[PDB]
Design a protein around this nucleic acid. Structure first.
Ligand SMILES: Nc1ncnc2c1ncn2[C@@H]1O[C@H](COP(=O)(O)OP(=O)(O)NP(=O)(O)O)[C@@H](O)[C@H]1O
Ligand SMILES: [Mg+2]
Length: 408
RNA sequence: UUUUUU
Protein backbone atom coordinates (compact mmCIF):
# COMPACT_ATOMS: atom_id res chain seq x y z
CA UNK A 1 0.00 0.00 0.00
CA UNK A 2 2.31 2.79 -1.30
CA UNK A 3 2.79 5.27 -4.21
CA UNK A 4 4.74 2.76 -6.30
CA UNK A 5 1.90 0.26 -5.77
CA UNK A 6 0.32 2.55 -8.42
CA UNK A 7 1.96 0.09 -10.82
CA UNK A 8 -1.49 -1.53 -10.36
CA UNK A 9 -2.95 1.65 -11.95
CA UNK A 10 -1.21 0.49 -15.17
CA UNK A 11 -2.01 -3.20 -14.51
CA UNK A 12 -5.38 -2.83 -16.34
CA UNK A 13 -5.03 0.23 -18.61
CA UNK A 14 -7.64 1.93 -20.82
CA UNK A 15 -10.02 0.35 -23.39
CA UNK A 16 -8.83 2.15 -26.55
CA UNK A 17 -5.44 3.36 -25.27
CA UNK A 18 -3.28 2.29 -28.21
CA UNK A 19 -5.93 3.28 -30.74
CA UNK A 20 -6.03 6.85 -29.35
CA UNK A 21 -2.23 7.05 -29.53
CA UNK A 22 -2.28 5.91 -33.18
CA UNK A 23 -4.53 8.95 -33.84
CA UNK A 24 -2.29 11.55 -32.13
CA UNK A 25 0.30 13.33 -34.35
CA UNK A 26 2.63 13.75 -31.35
CA UNK A 27 2.70 9.95 -30.89
CA UNK A 28 5.46 7.85 -32.45
CA UNK A 29 2.73 5.21 -33.03
CA UNK A 30 0.88 7.66 -35.31
CA UNK A 31 -0.86 6.23 -38.33
CA UNK A 32 -2.14 8.33 -41.26
CA UNK A 33 -2.47 5.37 -43.64
CA UNK A 34 -3.64 1.77 -43.34
CA UNK A 35 -1.54 -1.34 -43.89
CA UNK A 36 -3.15 -1.86 -47.34
CA UNK A 37 -2.02 1.65 -48.34
CA UNK A 38 1.53 0.33 -47.82
CA UNK A 39 0.81 -2.12 -50.66
CA UNK A 40 2.45 -5.15 -49.02
CA UNK A 41 2.01 -8.54 -50.68
CA UNK A 42 -1.20 -10.39 -49.70
CA UNK A 43 0.62 -13.07 -47.67
CA UNK A 44 2.48 -10.37 -45.78
CA UNK A 45 -0.72 -8.47 -45.04
CA UNK A 46 -2.35 -11.66 -43.73
CA UNK A 47 0.77 -12.25 -41.60
CA UNK A 48 0.42 -8.71 -40.26
CA UNK A 49 -3.25 -8.88 -39.32
CA UNK A 50 -2.75 -12.46 -38.02
CA UNK A 51 -0.56 -10.91 -35.29
CA UNK A 52 -3.43 -8.59 -34.30
CA UNK A 53 -1.70 -5.50 -35.74
CA UNK A 54 -4.37 -2.93 -36.68
CA UNK A 55 -2.48 0.11 -37.98
CA UNK A 56 1.13 0.87 -38.85
CA UNK A 57 3.29 2.89 -36.48
CA UNK A 58 5.14 6.00 -37.66
CA UNK A 59 8.36 4.09 -38.45
CA UNK A 60 6.52 1.30 -40.27
CA UNK A 61 4.54 3.78 -42.40
CA UNK A 62 7.63 5.73 -43.42
CA UNK A 63 10.27 2.96 -43.66
CA UNK A 64 8.42 0.32 -45.71
CA UNK A 65 7.88 2.47 -48.81
CA UNK A 66 11.59 3.44 -48.65
CA UNK A 67 12.63 -0.20 -48.18
CA UNK A 68 10.24 -1.70 -50.76
CA UNK A 69 11.00 1.04 -53.36
CA UNK A 70 12.54 -0.27 -56.59
CA UNK A 71 15.38 -0.55 -57.38
CA UNK A 72 16.58 -1.26 -53.81
CA UNK A 73 18.11 1.48 -51.67
CA UNK A 74 19.91 1.11 -48.31
CA UNK A 75 18.35 2.63 -45.18
CA UNK A 76 19.64 3.83 -41.79
CA UNK A 77 16.57 4.44 -39.63
CA UNK A 78 15.86 5.50 -36.05
CA UNK A 79 12.67 5.08 -34.00
CA UNK A 80 11.94 5.02 -30.25
CA UNK A 81 11.61 2.05 -27.86
CA UNK A 82 8.66 -0.31 -28.57
CA UNK A 83 7.54 1.39 -31.82
CA UNK A 84 7.57 -1.71 -34.05
CA UNK A 85 10.92 -1.62 -35.89
CA UNK A 86 11.12 -5.45 -35.98
CA UNK A 87 7.89 -5.77 -37.98
CA UNK A 88 9.28 -2.95 -40.14
CA UNK A 89 12.46 -4.78 -41.24
CA UNK A 90 11.00 -8.34 -41.08
CA UNK A 91 8.35 -7.25 -43.57
CA UNK A 92 11.24 -5.77 -45.60
CA UNK A 93 13.09 -9.12 -45.59
CA UNK A 94 10.07 -11.29 -46.29
CA UNK A 95 9.08 -8.96 -49.12
CA UNK A 96 12.31 -9.65 -51.08
CA UNK A 97 12.60 -13.42 -50.46
CA UNK A 98 11.71 -15.84 -53.29
CA UNK A 99 10.68 -18.98 -51.33
CA UNK A 100 11.36 -21.30 -54.30
CA UNK A 101 15.12 -20.74 -53.93
CA UNK A 102 16.30 -22.95 -51.05
CA UNK A 103 19.27 -20.89 -49.84
CA UNK A 104 19.79 -17.90 -47.51
CA UNK A 105 18.62 -14.72 -49.26
CA UNK A 106 18.06 -12.62 -46.13
CA UNK A 107 20.36 -12.26 -43.16
CA UNK A 108 19.68 -10.49 -39.86
CA UNK A 109 22.12 -9.60 -37.06
CA UNK A 110 21.14 -9.12 -33.40
CA UNK A 111 23.67 -8.24 -30.65
CA UNK A 112 22.64 -11.06 -28.28
CA UNK A 113 21.32 -14.63 -28.06
CA UNK A 114 17.88 -13.75 -26.72
CA UNK A 115 17.18 -10.93 -29.19
CA UNK A 116 17.94 -13.33 -32.07
CA UNK A 117 15.51 -15.87 -30.57
CA UNK A 118 12.84 -13.21 -30.02
CA UNK A 119 13.23 -11.74 -33.53
CA UNK A 120 13.32 -15.24 -35.10
CA UNK A 121 9.85 -15.87 -33.68
CA UNK A 122 8.50 -12.66 -35.23
CA UNK A 123 9.99 -13.72 -38.60
CA UNK A 124 8.39 -17.17 -38.48
CA UNK A 125 4.99 -15.81 -37.41
CA UNK A 126 5.08 -12.88 -39.86
CA UNK A 127 5.82 -15.13 -42.87
CA UNK A 128 3.69 -18.09 -41.75
CA UNK A 129 1.45 -17.62 -44.79
CA UNK A 130 4.33 -18.77 -46.92
CA UNK A 131 4.06 -22.54 -46.23
CA UNK A 132 7.63 -23.09 -47.51
CA UNK A 133 9.34 -20.15 -45.83
CA UNK A 134 11.87 -21.50 -43.31
CA UNK A 135 14.15 -19.76 -40.78
CA UNK A 136 17.63 -20.86 -39.68
CA UNK A 137 19.19 -19.80 -36.39
CA UNK A 138 22.86 -18.86 -36.68
CA UNK A 139 23.11 -18.67 -32.87
CA UNK A 140 25.43 -20.16 -30.25
CA UNK A 141 23.09 -22.98 -29.20
CA UNK A 142 23.04 -24.47 -32.69
CA UNK A 143 25.18 -27.08 -34.44
CA UNK A 144 24.65 -28.70 -37.83
CA UNK A 145 26.33 -31.71 -39.52
CA UNK A 146 29.49 -30.19 -41.06
CA UNK A 147 29.94 -29.88 -44.85
CA UNK A 148 26.32 -28.97 -45.62
CA UNK A 149 24.58 -25.82 -46.86
CA UNK A 150 21.46 -24.64 -45.05
CA UNK A 151 18.32 -24.68 -47.19
CA UNK A 152 16.36 -22.12 -45.15
CA UNK A 153 15.59 -18.85 -46.96
CA UNK A 154 16.05 -16.52 -43.97
CA UNK A 155 18.91 -16.64 -41.46
CA UNK A 156 18.89 -14.81 -38.12
CA UNK A 157 21.97 -14.90 -35.93
CA UNK A 158 24.55 -13.30 -33.68
CA UNK A 159 27.79 -11.85 -35.18
CA UNK A 160 30.21 -14.64 -34.24
CA UNK A 161 28.18 -17.68 -35.31
CA UNK A 162 27.03 -16.04 -38.55
CA UNK A 163 30.69 -15.24 -39.29
CA UNK A 164 31.66 -18.91 -38.86
CA UNK A 165 28.66 -20.05 -40.95
CA UNK A 166 29.72 -17.64 -43.69
CA UNK A 167 33.41 -18.62 -43.48
CA UNK A 168 35.07 -21.82 -42.17
CA UNK A 169 31.79 -23.78 -41.84
CA UNK A 170 30.52 -22.85 -45.33
CA UNK A 171 26.89 -23.18 -44.25
CA UNK A 172 25.85 -19.90 -45.89
CA UNK A 173 27.09 -18.56 -49.22
CA UNK A 174 27.22 -14.89 -48.16
CA UNK A 175 27.44 -13.72 -51.80
CA UNK A 176 23.78 -14.69 -52.37
CA UNK A 177 22.44 -12.32 -49.67
CA UNK A 178 19.91 -9.78 -51.04
CA UNK A 179 18.84 -8.05 -47.80
CA UNK A 180 21.17 -7.50 -44.85
CA UNK A 181 19.59 -6.16 -41.62
CA UNK A 182 21.53 -4.89 -38.60
CA UNK A 183 19.09 -4.64 -35.70
CA UNK A 184 20.26 -2.37 -32.89
CA UNK A 185 22.57 -1.09 -35.63
CA UNK A 186 24.45 1.56 -33.62
CA UNK A 187 25.99 -1.00 -31.24
CA UNK A 188 26.47 -3.45 -34.12
CA UNK A 189 28.89 -0.98 -35.82
CA UNK A 190 30.46 0.80 -32.78
CA UNK A 191 34.07 -0.18 -31.93
CA UNK A 192 33.15 -1.07 -28.37
CA UNK A 193 30.20 -3.07 -29.80
CA UNK A 194 30.31 -5.64 -32.64
CA UNK A 195 32.03 -3.51 -35.32
CA UNK A 196 34.83 -5.96 -36.17
CA UNK A 197 32.68 -9.04 -36.84
CA UNK A 198 29.79 -6.97 -38.25
CA UNK A 199 31.97 -5.29 -40.87
CA UNK A 200 33.82 -8.51 -41.63
CA UNK A 201 30.46 -10.16 -42.43
CA UNK A 202 29.32 -7.12 -44.46
CA UNK A 203 32.48 -7.32 -46.59
CA UNK A 204 31.50 -10.86 -47.61
CA UNK A 205 28.18 -9.66 -49.10
CA UNK A 206 27.56 -8.94 -52.81
CA UNK A 207 27.74 -5.42 -54.30
CA UNK A 208 23.95 -5.49 -54.97
CA UNK A 209 22.85 -6.07 -51.39
CA UNK A 210 20.22 -3.87 -49.77
CA UNK A 211 21.33 -2.86 -46.29
CA UNK A 212 19.04 -1.85 -43.46
CA UNK A 213 20.11 -0.44 -40.10
CA UNK A 214 17.63 0.01 -37.20
CA UNK A 215 18.01 1.32 -33.64
CA UNK A 216 16.40 3.64 -31.11
CA UNK A 217 19.74 5.44 -30.75
CA UNK A 218 22.61 6.62 -32.97
CA UNK A 219 25.40 8.29 -31.06
CA UNK A 220 26.76 11.33 -32.89
CA UNK A 221 29.95 9.66 -34.24
CA UNK A 222 28.18 6.34 -34.92
CA UNK A 223 25.63 8.16 -37.11
CA UNK A 224 28.55 9.64 -39.08
CA UNK A 225 30.27 6.24 -39.31
CA UNK A 226 27.11 4.45 -40.44
CA UNK A 227 26.93 6.99 -43.32
CA UNK A 228 30.35 5.88 -44.62
CA UNK A 229 29.90 2.10 -44.29
CA UNK A 230 26.39 1.94 -45.79
CA UNK A 231 26.26 2.90 -49.51
CA UNK A 232 23.73 5.54 -50.72
CA UNK A 233 21.40 5.53 -47.75
CA UNK A 234 17.98 6.95 -47.11
CA UNK A 235 18.04 8.25 -43.55
CA UNK A 236 15.45 8.52 -40.78
CA UNK A 237 16.98 10.44 -37.87
CA UNK A 238 15.07 11.67 -34.81
CA UNK A 239 15.39 15.02 -33.06
CA UNK A 240 16.59 14.47 -29.49
CA UNK A 241 13.35 15.85 -28.03
CA UNK A 242 11.63 12.88 -29.79
CA UNK A 243 13.88 10.19 -28.27
CA UNK A 244 12.17 9.68 -24.86
CA UNK A 245 8.64 8.35 -24.45
CA UNK A 246 5.97 10.35 -22.60
CA UNK A 247 4.57 6.93 -21.82
CA UNK A 248 7.55 5.82 -19.61
CA UNK A 249 7.81 7.93 -16.47
CA UNK A 250 11.27 8.28 -14.89
CA UNK A 251 12.07 8.28 -11.16
CA UNK A 252 15.12 8.02 -8.88
CA UNK A 253 15.79 7.08 -5.24
CA UNK A 254 18.69 8.56 -3.28
CA UNK A 255 20.91 6.18 -1.25
CA UNK A 256 24.39 6.07 0.29
CA UNK A 257 25.62 2.49 -0.38
CA UNK A 258 24.95 -0.84 -2.11
CA UNK A 259 23.43 -2.19 1.12
CA UNK A 260 21.06 0.80 1.15
CA UNK A 261 20.08 0.12 -2.49
CA UNK A 262 19.37 -3.50 -1.54
CA UNK A 263 17.12 -2.39 1.31
CA UNK A 264 15.15 0.07 -0.85
CA UNK A 265 14.46 -2.56 -3.50
CA UNK A 266 13.58 -5.04 -0.71
CA UNK A 267 10.88 -2.63 0.49
CA UNK A 268 9.67 -2.10 -3.09
CA UNK A 269 9.57 -5.80 -4.07
CA UNK A 270 5.85 -6.20 -3.21
CA UNK A 271 5.11 -3.47 -5.77
CA UNK A 272 7.50 -4.82 -8.42
CA UNK A 273 5.99 -8.34 -8.27
CA UNK A 274 2.45 -7.02 -8.84
CA UNK A 275 3.20 -7.30 -12.54
CA UNK A 276 6.69 -7.93 -13.88
CA UNK A 277 10.02 -6.06 -13.70
CA UNK A 278 13.68 -5.89 -14.77
CA UNK A 279 16.72 -4.88 -12.75
CA UNK A 280 19.94 -3.87 -14.53
CA UNK A 281 23.47 -4.02 -13.05
CA UNK A 282 26.85 -2.73 -14.22
CA UNK A 283 28.52 -6.14 -14.00
CA UNK A 284 27.87 -9.90 -13.89
CA UNK A 285 29.15 -10.21 -10.32
CA UNK A 286 26.73 -7.56 -8.99
CA UNK A 287 23.94 -9.27 -10.95
CA UNK A 288 24.75 -12.56 -9.26
CA UNK A 289 25.26 -10.92 -5.84
CA UNK A 290 21.92 -9.14 -6.04
CA UNK A 291 20.19 -12.37 -7.06
CA UNK A 292 21.65 -14.30 -4.09
CA UNK A 293 20.85 -11.47 -1.69
CA UNK A 294 17.20 -11.18 -2.85
CA UNK A 295 16.89 -14.98 -2.78
CA UNK A 296 18.30 -15.14 0.74
CA UNK A 297 15.76 -12.48 1.69
CA UNK A 298 13.12 -15.00 0.55
CA UNK A 299 12.07 -13.39 -2.74
CA UNK A 300 11.82 -15.59 -5.84
CA UNK A 301 14.16 -14.03 -8.41
CA UNK A 302 15.57 -14.79 -11.88
CA UNK A 303 19.18 -14.28 -13.01
CA UNK A 304 20.34 -13.79 -16.60
CA UNK A 305 23.87 -12.94 -17.77
CA UNK A 306 26.39 -13.78 -20.48
CA UNK A 307 28.49 -16.08 -18.26
CA UNK A 308 25.55 -18.52 -18.20
CA UNK A 309 25.42 -21.23 -20.87
CA UNK A 310 22.85 -20.84 -23.64
CA UNK A 311 20.68 -23.73 -22.33
CA UNK A 312 20.30 -21.92 -19.01
CA UNK A 313 19.86 -18.51 -20.72
CA UNK A 314 17.14 -19.91 -23.04
CA UNK A 315 15.50 -21.50 -19.98
CA UNK A 316 15.31 -18.33 -17.92
CA UNK A 317 14.20 -16.00 -20.67
CA UNK A 318 11.30 -18.33 -21.52
CA UNK A 319 10.30 -18.67 -17.83
CA UNK A 320 10.34 -14.90 -17.50
CA UNK A 321 8.45 -14.64 -20.80
CA UNK A 322 5.60 -16.76 -19.38
CA UNK A 323 5.43 -14.81 -16.10
CA UNK A 324 6.72 -17.82 -14.14
CA UNK A 325 9.43 -15.43 -12.99
CA UNK A 326 8.35 -11.88 -12.22
CA UNK A 327 11.75 -10.22 -11.63
CA UNK A 328 14.88 -10.64 -13.76
CA UNK A 329 18.21 -9.46 -12.32
CA UNK A 330 20.25 -8.94 -15.48
CA UNK A 331 23.15 -7.09 -17.16
CA UNK A 332 23.21 -4.98 -20.35
CA UNK A 333 22.69 -8.32 -22.15
CA UNK A 334 18.98 -7.42 -21.87
CA UNK A 335 19.35 -3.64 -22.30
CA UNK A 336 18.26 -3.75 -25.93
CA UNK A 337 15.47 -5.17 -28.06
CA UNK A 338 13.94 -7.50 -25.49
CA UNK A 339 10.15 -7.27 -25.60
CA UNK A 340 8.07 -8.67 -22.72
CA UNK A 341 4.57 -7.12 -22.54
CA UNK A 342 4.16 -7.46 -18.76
CA UNK A 343 7.40 -5.68 -17.71
CA UNK A 344 5.91 -2.60 -16.02
CA UNK A 345 8.99 -1.57 -14.01
CA UNK A 346 12.62 -1.22 -15.07
CA UNK A 347 15.18 -0.67 -12.28
CA UNK A 348 18.71 0.61 -12.81
CA UNK A 349 20.22 -0.81 -9.62
CA UNK A 350 23.45 0.47 -11.14
CA UNK A 351 23.34 3.49 -13.46
CA UNK A 352 24.49 2.73 -17.02
CA UNK A 353 28.06 3.93 -17.44
CA UNK A 354 30.36 3.00 -20.33
CA UNK A 355 33.77 1.28 -20.39
CA UNK A 356 35.55 4.48 -19.30
CA UNK A 357 32.96 5.35 -16.61
CA UNK A 358 31.05 7.92 -18.66
CA UNK A 359 27.26 8.12 -18.50
CA UNK A 360 25.97 5.73 -21.19
CA UNK A 361 23.12 7.82 -22.59
CA UNK A 362 22.19 5.30 -25.29
CA UNK A 363 22.04 2.29 -22.97
CA UNK A 364 19.96 4.25 -20.48
CA UNK A 365 17.24 4.93 -23.09
CA UNK A 366 17.23 1.28 -24.25
CA UNK A 367 17.10 0.05 -20.65
CA UNK A 368 14.09 2.20 -19.68
CA UNK A 369 12.60 1.19 -23.08
CA UNK A 370 11.96 -2.39 -21.88
CA UNK A 371 8.81 -0.99 -20.20
CA UNK A 372 5.86 1.00 -21.62
CA UNK A 373 6.05 -0.75 -24.98
CA UNK A 374 3.84 0.01 -27.98
CA UNK A 375 1.48 2.35 -26.19
CA UNK A 376 1.57 0.72 -22.74
CA UNK A 377 2.42 2.95 -19.81
CA UNK A 378 5.61 2.09 -17.88
CA UNK A 379 7.92 3.04 -15.02
CA UNK A 380 11.72 3.39 -14.65
CA UNK A 381 13.28 3.73 -11.18
CA UNK A 382 16.94 4.76 -10.80
CA UNK A 383 18.94 3.72 -7.71
CA UNK A 384 21.47 6.47 -6.84
CA UNK A 385 24.16 5.37 -4.36
CA UNK A 386 26.49 8.42 -4.18
CA UNK A 387 27.10 12.04 -5.18
CA UNK A 388 29.17 10.95 -8.16
CA UNK A 389 26.35 8.63 -9.18
CA UNK A 390 23.89 11.49 -8.77
CA UNK A 391 26.01 13.47 -11.28
CA UNK A 392 25.88 10.68 -13.84
CA UNK A 393 22.07 10.78 -13.65
CA UNK A 394 21.97 14.60 -13.89
CA UNK A 395 24.15 14.59 -17.02
CA UNK A 396 21.84 12.00 -18.56
CA UNK A 397 18.90 14.15 -17.55
CA UNK A 398 20.17 17.10 -19.59
CA UNK A 399 21.44 14.93 -22.43
CA UNK A 400 17.78 14.04 -23.02
CA UNK A 401 16.50 17.21 -21.34
CA UNK A 402 13.89 15.12 -19.45
CA UNK A 403 13.75 15.74 -15.69
CA UNK A 404 13.62 12.70 -13.36
CA UNK A 405 11.41 12.77 -10.23
CA UNK A 406 12.62 11.90 -6.73
CA UNK A 407 10.77 9.07 -4.93
CA UNK A 408 10.22 8.90 -1.13
C1' U B 1 33.03 -2.99 -18.07
C1' U B 2 28.85 -5.55 -21.25
C1' U B 3 28.35 -8.50 -25.35
C1' U B 4 29.90 -11.38 -29.45
C1' U B 5 32.26 -17.96 -33.23
C1' U B 6 32.71 -24.78 -33.81
N1 LIG C 1 1.21 -1.94 -35.77
C1 LIG C 1 1.29 -2.57 -34.57
N2 LIG C 1 0.21 -2.74 -33.77
C2 LIG C 1 0.26 -3.37 -32.58
N3 LIG C 1 1.40 -3.88 -32.09
C3 LIG C 1 2.57 -3.77 -32.78
C4 LIG C 1 2.58 -3.10 -34.09
N4 LIG C 1 3.84 -3.15 -34.55
C5 LIG C 1 4.59 -3.79 -33.60
N5 LIG C 1 3.82 -4.16 -32.55
C6 LIG C 1 4.22 -4.89 -31.31
O1 LIG C 1 4.75 -3.98 -30.32
C7 LIG C 1 6.04 -4.40 -29.89
C8 LIG C 1 7.03 -3.51 -30.62
O2 LIG C 1 8.35 -3.75 -30.18
P1 LIG C 1 9.48 -4.26 -31.19
O3 LIG C 1 9.17 -3.86 -32.62
O4 LIG C 1 9.69 -5.71 -30.83
O5 LIG C 1 10.79 -3.45 -30.72
P2 LIG C 1 11.21 -2.04 -31.34
O6 LIG C 1 9.96 -1.31 -31.74
O7 LIG C 1 12.25 -2.29 -32.39
N6 LIG C 1 11.96 -1.07 -30.13
P3 LIG C 1 13.43 -1.55 -29.34
O8 LIG C 1 12.99 -1.78 -27.93
O9 LIG C 1 14.28 -0.31 -29.53
O10 LIG C 1 13.91 -2.78 -30.08
C9 LIG C 1 6.15 -5.86 -30.31
O11 LIG C 1 5.69 -6.71 -29.26
C10 LIG C 1 5.26 -5.97 -31.53
O12 LIG C 1 4.63 -7.25 -31.65
MG1 LIG D 1 13.55 -4.03 -31.52
Amino acid sequence: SLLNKLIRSNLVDNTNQVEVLQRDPNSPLYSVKSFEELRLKPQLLQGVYAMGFNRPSKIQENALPLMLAEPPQNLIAQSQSGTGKTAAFVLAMLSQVEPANKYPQCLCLSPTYELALQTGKVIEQMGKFYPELKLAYAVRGNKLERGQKISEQIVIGTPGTVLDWCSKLKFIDPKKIKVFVLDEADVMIATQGHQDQSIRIQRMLPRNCQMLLFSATFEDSVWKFAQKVVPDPNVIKLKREEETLDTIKQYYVLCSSRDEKFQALCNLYGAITIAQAMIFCHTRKTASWLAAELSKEGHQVALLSGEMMVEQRAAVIERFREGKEKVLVTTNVCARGIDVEQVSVVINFDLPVDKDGNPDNETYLHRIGRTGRFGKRGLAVNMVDSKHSMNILNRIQEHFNKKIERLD
